[PDB]
């Protein structure tokens, strides 16, 4: 974040370390020597335009890429930072339900041995694309005045690298914040209600208690299924939970207390909680996230330089291309402090089904209610045909001679005498003929 030349990721020591790109090309005017001569190498490089251009392009491109890439891989954001995108991604999640185990029955087993498991529910990824360049500049006098000694070259290279990479770190942090904002905006976070932690000390203590309760309930050994984008019954270990807390909020709470909410001690937390000032999404305060939830992949990291003969200067272009993916099966909590409605969003089990012309499918709805009250779900079919009817329990029955595609709809009402408030979940059902 404040890189100096002493951060030597690769190669041996001493400034004379690089000074060899002449081998790969050139090495007829620069002395291939490792000594105290600094004027000779400067004169050899500075002879003409061709030698200048070759040396500058090589040093800027290859060493710059190596240095910044090997420095940006150990930033405090390395936890969610993975390598190059794999081939054959298929842009699809595949998670299997943690079901129970059948009882051993010889009579039942002898009846059928070719049965298959339930569908795994294959939902797509949530991704965002990142593209940009930073575009710094080199003046000609810098090369002239950077060869007086063996430390000026160090200062010049380190100045370039530090001038570029610091802005990239800030953009990475801002992109993480923007992704969290967008995910909350689409409403897939499971909200937990808190009220004005910064207002009073009692509010802060109550927020800490709710923090601890949610973190303890997320890490239940037998699974939860409550906190998810869809009911899948996963389980998250305590050592993987990540906390994204607003800066002014985090300032008030001590490092402790919030530390003892989880089960490790202080030092093991500074790499498990990031601080971002301002969410700008109604009343978002803090977000509790499984380490798997956020995943970033990188595609392109390339330098190219251009030379302007009229102005005697060179340019810069770091092209950083990334695909920030969001998983929909990892646990996620919103922890919003506002006036959110009683029911945020309902989720329909078997979202995708392939029912025959005479079969049936059982659907269940999971209401995500912020209060302790009970809400009833009214099922509907939409679609449009004769003979297709769904029961009050969600059991859909398909009649013969049908060709349209049905969309099971689950609706809840949290309104009043006037009802401009509908929370609806959709399940797309495809039909196959017999």
């Amino acid at each position: 974040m404040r890189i100096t030349f002493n951060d030597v990721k690769t190669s041996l020591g001493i400034t004379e370390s690089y000074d060899i790109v002449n081998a790969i090309r050139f090495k007829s005017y620069v002395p291939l020597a490792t000594a105290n001569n600094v004027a000779e190498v400067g004169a050899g490089i500075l002879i003409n335009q061709t030698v200048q251009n070759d040396f500058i392009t090589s040093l800027v491109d290859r060493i710059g890429l190596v240095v910044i890439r090997q420095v940006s891989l150990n930033n405090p954001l390395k936890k969610f930072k993975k390598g190059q995108i794999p081939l054959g991604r298929t842009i699809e999640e595949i998670y299997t339900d943690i079901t129970k185990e059948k009882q051993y029955d010889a009579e039942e087993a002898e009846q059928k041995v070719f049965e298959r498991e339930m569908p795994n529910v294959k939902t797509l990824f949530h991704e965002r694309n990142r593209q940009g360049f930073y575009h710094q500049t080199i003046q000609d006098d810098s090369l002239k005045t950077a060869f007086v000694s063996w430390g000026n070259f160090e200062s010049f290279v380190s100045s370039i690298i530090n001038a570029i990479y610091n802005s990239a770190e800030v953009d990475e942090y801002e992109y993480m914040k923007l992704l969290v904002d967008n995910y909350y905006s689409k409403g897939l976070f499971t909200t937990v209600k808190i009220d004005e932690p910064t207002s009073s000390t009692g509010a802060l203590t109550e927020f800490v208690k709710k923090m601890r309760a949610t973190a303890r309930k997320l890490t239940l050994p037998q699974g939860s299924r409550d906190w998810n984008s869809m009911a899948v019954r996963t389980r998250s270990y305590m050592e993987d939970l990540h906390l994204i807390i607003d800066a002014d909020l985090e300032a008030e709470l001590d490092v402790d207390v919030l530390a003892k909410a989880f089960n490790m001690n202080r030092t093991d937390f500074l790499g498990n909680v990031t601080v971002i000032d301002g969410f700008a999404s109604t009343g978002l305060e803090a977000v509790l996230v499984d380490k798997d939830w956020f995943m970033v992949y990188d595609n392109l990291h390339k330098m190219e330089t251009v030379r302007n003969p009229r102005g005697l200067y060179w340019n810069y272009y770091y092209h950083v291309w990334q695909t920030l993916s969001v998983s929909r099966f990892a646990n996620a909590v919103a922890f919003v402090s506002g006036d959110v409605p009683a029911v945020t969003q309902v989720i329909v089990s078997p979202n995708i089904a392939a029912v025959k012309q005479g079969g049936q499918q059982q659907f269940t709805a999971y209401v995500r209610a912020t209060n302790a009250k009970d809400h009833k779900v009214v099922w509907s079919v939409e679609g449009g045909s004769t003979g297709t009817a769904i029961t009050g329990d969600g059991l859909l029955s398909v009649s013969g001679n049908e060709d349209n595609q049905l969309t099971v709809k689950a609706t809840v009402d949290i309104g009043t005498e006037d009802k401009p408030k509908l929370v609806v979940g959709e399940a797309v059902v495809s039909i196959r003929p017999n």
Binding site: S11, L12, I20, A23, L32, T34
Partner: peptide, 12 residues
């Protein structure tokens, strides 16, 4: 690529 891709005959 690493640093080694640019060979150094002046290493020793």
């Amino acid at each position: 690529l690493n640093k080694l891709l640019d060979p150094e005959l002046a290493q020793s």
